[PDB]
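User: Can you help me understand a structure? I only have the sequence.
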Amino acid sequence: LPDMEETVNKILRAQETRAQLYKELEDALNANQEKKIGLEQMGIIVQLVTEGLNEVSSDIRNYQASLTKELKLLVDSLQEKERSKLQATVKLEQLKVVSTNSPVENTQISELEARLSSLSKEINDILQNMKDEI
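Assistant: Let's start by predicting it. Here is the structure, written out as tokens:
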């Protein structure tokens, strides 16, 4: 109930909507990679998915003012990862389709996958610190 941690619950509630939205996003990239989905459609689904991502991003910004300066920093870093995680996810699918499996192009995927794997691991640590009121 108190206004301090009530606002943190809404931030955690928005992260649920963001995590679910990437699942709809990721499933759309795989649908185009497996050639089950044309390039034209995937572009409009990302348009639909990034809109909900844009709503969640703006909702969490509104929740920042009532938070402590240590908590506003954790949110600031949280959105930086989620912004880079969005672009690194869509950019990864396109590079996997055009790549001729040459070693130069082949390690772009591994570097981005390692980036995505580390970004996701960093995000959960930001949430757990927010859960512990860091």
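Now, to help you interpret it: Residues 3-131 form a domain with the Four Helix Bundle (Hemerythrin (Met), subunit A) fold (CATH 1.20.120). The helical segments are 3-33, 39-62, 69-98, 103-131. Let me know which part you'd like to focus on.
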